[PDB]
């Protein structure tokens, strides 16, 4: 509720306004362990719970029931993430799930289909990912068509900012938890593909942590 006390060196620097934007953290690939960092840089992040499913466990007296919740968040402008947490109470799990989702926010790369006229709308290349017997494939599409996909994965692409795409699925896609984790891995790898327009050499600069001196 009241003002938070930073616990890590990075948290103190953020509170003092010594870093420009979240992409500065992304460029140097620094771990994030405090959820107050994300909402300080990225307000208006929408959250929406997918479903809750019970899980059992056999004991001498009877069966012990817990509730598992899946939550994904995004800003519809290139940032998205999800988190999963289970607990003994339905309400408690949802609150903890939202925290884990914020910690995993990642950027996406958006390109063009054919000729470029500003405001990229689709994926730059075709990418795919696998998470335990489920494979999802994404294909760039021309402007004008909508998203062609199942309702489960259409929501994730909507919050990532991608407008036009083609989708393909394989394996047992009825496992909803596995399906979402496979889509999340495919989008994360867009920046890992080396297109010819990125061949230009870049200049190495020192990280913000090294050249700043923190407060006591």
């Amino acid at each position: 509720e009241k003002e938070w006390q930073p616990v890590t060196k990075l948290g103190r620097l953020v509170k003092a306004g010594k870093i420009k934007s979240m992409e500065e953290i992304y460029l140097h690939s620094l771990p994030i362990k405090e959820y107050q960092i994300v909402d300080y840089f990225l307000p208006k992040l929408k959250d929406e719970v997918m479903k809750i499913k019970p899980v059992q466990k056999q004991t001498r007296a009877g069966q012990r029931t817990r509730f598992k919740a899946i939550v994904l968040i995004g800003d519809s402008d290139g940032h998205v993430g999800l988190g999963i947490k289970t607990s003994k109470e339905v309400a408690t799990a949802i609150r903890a799930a939202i925290i884990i989702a914020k910690l995993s926010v990642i950027p996406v790369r958006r390109g063009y289909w054919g000729a470029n006229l500003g405001r990229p709308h689709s994926l730059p290349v075709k990418q795919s990912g696998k998470c335990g017997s489920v494979t999802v494939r994404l294909i760039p599409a021309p402007r004008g068509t909508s998203l062609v996909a199942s309702p489960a994965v259409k929501r994730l692409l909507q919050l990532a900012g991608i407008e036009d795409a083609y989708t393909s699925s394989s394996g047992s896609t009825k496992t909803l938890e596995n399906t979402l984790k496979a889509t999340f891995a495919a989008v994360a790898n867009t920046y890992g593909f080396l297109t010819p327009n990125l061949w230009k050499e870049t200049k190495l600069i020192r990280s913000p942590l090294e050249e700043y001196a923190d407060t006591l």
Partner: peptide, 21 residues
Amino acid sequence: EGEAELKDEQAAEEIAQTEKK
């Protein structure tokens, strides 16, 4: 069977918001 507290939750948005008679 987590349907007890959906009447007065207001802390999340469900997919198919149940219309009430």
